[PDB]
């Protein structure tokens, strides 16, 4: 008789006495939980299913639910006679393999737990048979994949990756700033008036890439970088400049630096666009409401998206200016009312006391939208709740604006 067992690396089959129940009785009664009995009955047929994590997860999901094509290609040649009896643990798998095409007899979760227990006990002794390794870390990997599938982690919904993105973005802003300042200074030995007249880091570096020395600039155009007046201005300064003459080794290395500057700027805008796309994927309603950037700032400030959901509305209203918050609470002045939301589009659209009121109502509506997007076990990702909350808050904003103050 055959017995089937499931291993993290493969599917195993062992042949034994057809009187399997009586064999189990002998096992448990004589304490045959040892290498003696398992060398008596080592293996019948093994199959190590391929090392593809998707194949692993799907095959085990099928083990949980139904019968696999791997199972078919294993059970193609179990039998010698038309009738063979196979031990299986799962009852649903038992009746499924009853209904399958070969139609050999099978037995469900009988007293054969003795067999399963002992063959797992000296499965380490079975490892020299087919799987010459330690299955522990195999099981770790498979379990993590299975848990991922069971919880249904969409590859896009990872708040921690969002915090990574925003922190990296801030750091990129700081370091691009310091590099641009350094390059402006180092080129200052050659064209200080330009350093003063233009302020854009990218514009400066592209200038260094296009022109190299002042009259070369006088003869070269800069239309696609700067407008006409600014490029003629740098023309005049090039005529009357106070910098030295530069060797081409120096010029080469300063040019390489400016190239690094523009490549960083291109990367930074690219990564910001990435962050836009990813947040639209994750929490679309909040993005629809307040805006992708301030949504990122909100999630970052709270840490977890879930904890940000847990926070009440007022904390979302004043999530940023906590320093002034607590200082004013302690010193009995009046608390701040904007915090981090102040950079939201609608609160920017409002004016003064209208800014305060729209801030409050936007805080509450955003709290609602945030909770829905975070805890929606299923979610359309369209952002329809965001659109409706936005419509409501816009009506509120128009009402406040049309609410005049002076008696006409």
């Amino acid at each position: 008789a055959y017995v089937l067992t499931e291993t993290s690396a493969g599917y195993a089959l062992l042949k034994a006495s057809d009187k399997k129940i009586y064999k189990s009785s002998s096992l448990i009664q004589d304490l045959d939980s040892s290498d003696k009995v398992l060398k008596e009955f080592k293996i019948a047929a093994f199959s190590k299913f391929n090392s593809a994590a998707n194949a692993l997860e799907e095959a085990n999901s099928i083990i949980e639910g139904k019968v696999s094509s791997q199972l078919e290609k294993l059970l193609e040649e179990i039998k010698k006679d038309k009738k063979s009896t196979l031990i299986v643990s799962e009852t649903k798998l038992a009746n499924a393999i009853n209904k399958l095409g070969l139609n050999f007899n099978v037995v469900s979760d009988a007293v054969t737990l003795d067999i399963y227990r002992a063959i797992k006990e000296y499965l380490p002794e079975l490892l020299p048979g087919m799987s010459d390794n330690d299955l522990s870390k195999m099981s770790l990997g498979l379990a993590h994949s299975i848990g991922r599938h069971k919880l249904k982690f969409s590859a896009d919904k990872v708040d921690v990756m969002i915090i990574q993105a925003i922190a990296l973005l801030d750091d990129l802003d700081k370091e691009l700033n310091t590099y641009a300042m350094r390059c402006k200074e180092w080129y200052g030995w050659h064209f200080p008036e330009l350093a003063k007249i233009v302020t854009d880091s990218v514009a400066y570096a592209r200038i260094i890439l296009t022109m190299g020395i002042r009259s070369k600039a006088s003869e070269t155009d800069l239309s696609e970088i700067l407008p006409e007046e600014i490029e003629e201005r740098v023309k005049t300064a090039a005529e009357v400049s106070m910098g030295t003459e530069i060797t081409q080794t120096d010029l080469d290395n300063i040019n390489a630096l400016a190239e690094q500057i523009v490549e960083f700027a291109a990367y930074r805008e690219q990564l910001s666009n990435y962050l836009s796309a990813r947040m639209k994927a994750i929490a679309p309603n909040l993005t629809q409401l307040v805006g992708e950037l301030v949504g990122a700032r909100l999630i970052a400030h709270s840490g977890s998206l879930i904890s940000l959901a847990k926070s009440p509305a007022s904390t979302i209203q004043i999530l940023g200016a906590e320093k002034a918050l607590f200082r004013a609470l302690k010193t009995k002045h009046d608390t701040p009312k904007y915090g981090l939301l102040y950079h939201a589009s609608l609160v920017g659209q409002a004016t003064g006391k209208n800014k305060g009121k729209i801030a409050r109502v936007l805080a509450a509506k955003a709290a609602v939208s945030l909770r829905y997007d975070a805890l929606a076990e299923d979610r359309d990702d369209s952002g329809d709740i965001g659109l409706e909350s936005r419509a409501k808050v816009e009506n509120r904003l128009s009402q406040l604006e049309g609410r005049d103050l002076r008696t006409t």
Partner: protein, 121 residues
């Protein structure tokens, strides 16, 4: 839907809403999702009542986390407009918090409802 899991039947809803109005009258009740979360944070809540037909359900569904984290009983009731009547305000309310105060006349009621809520949990 099992997301709003503990949903009171008619009788338990009656006694819940009655003690809710009592507490609204003696002013031991905080009305609204946000203020309820605030009481929950401060640990001053005797228990939590929620609506079950909110549009949608998650906006208050956030609460059971903090509730059963801090061991504060919570229960759902069928209609938010009914809950608004029970609270005694002009607008439908979706979630209210019965606070805790030793110097309350409704002590024994709140404790009976909280008893039955815990049994149901």
């Amino acid at each position: 839907n099992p997301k709003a899991f503990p949903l009171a039947d008619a009788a338990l809803t009656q006694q819940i809403l009655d003690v809710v109005q009592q507490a609204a009258n003696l002013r031991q009740l905080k009305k609204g999702a946000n203020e309820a979360t605030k009481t929950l944070n401060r640990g001053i809540s005797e228990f939590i009542i929620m609506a079950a037909d909110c549009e949608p359900i998650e906006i208050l569904l956030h609460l059971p986390l903090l509730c059963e984290d801090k061991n504060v009983p919570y229960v759902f009731v069928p209609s938010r407009v009914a809950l608004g009547r029970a609270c005694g305000v002009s607008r439908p309310v979706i979630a209210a918090s019965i606070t805790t105060n030793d110097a309350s006349a409704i002590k024994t009621q709140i404790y009976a409802v909280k008893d039955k809520i815990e049994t149901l949990l």
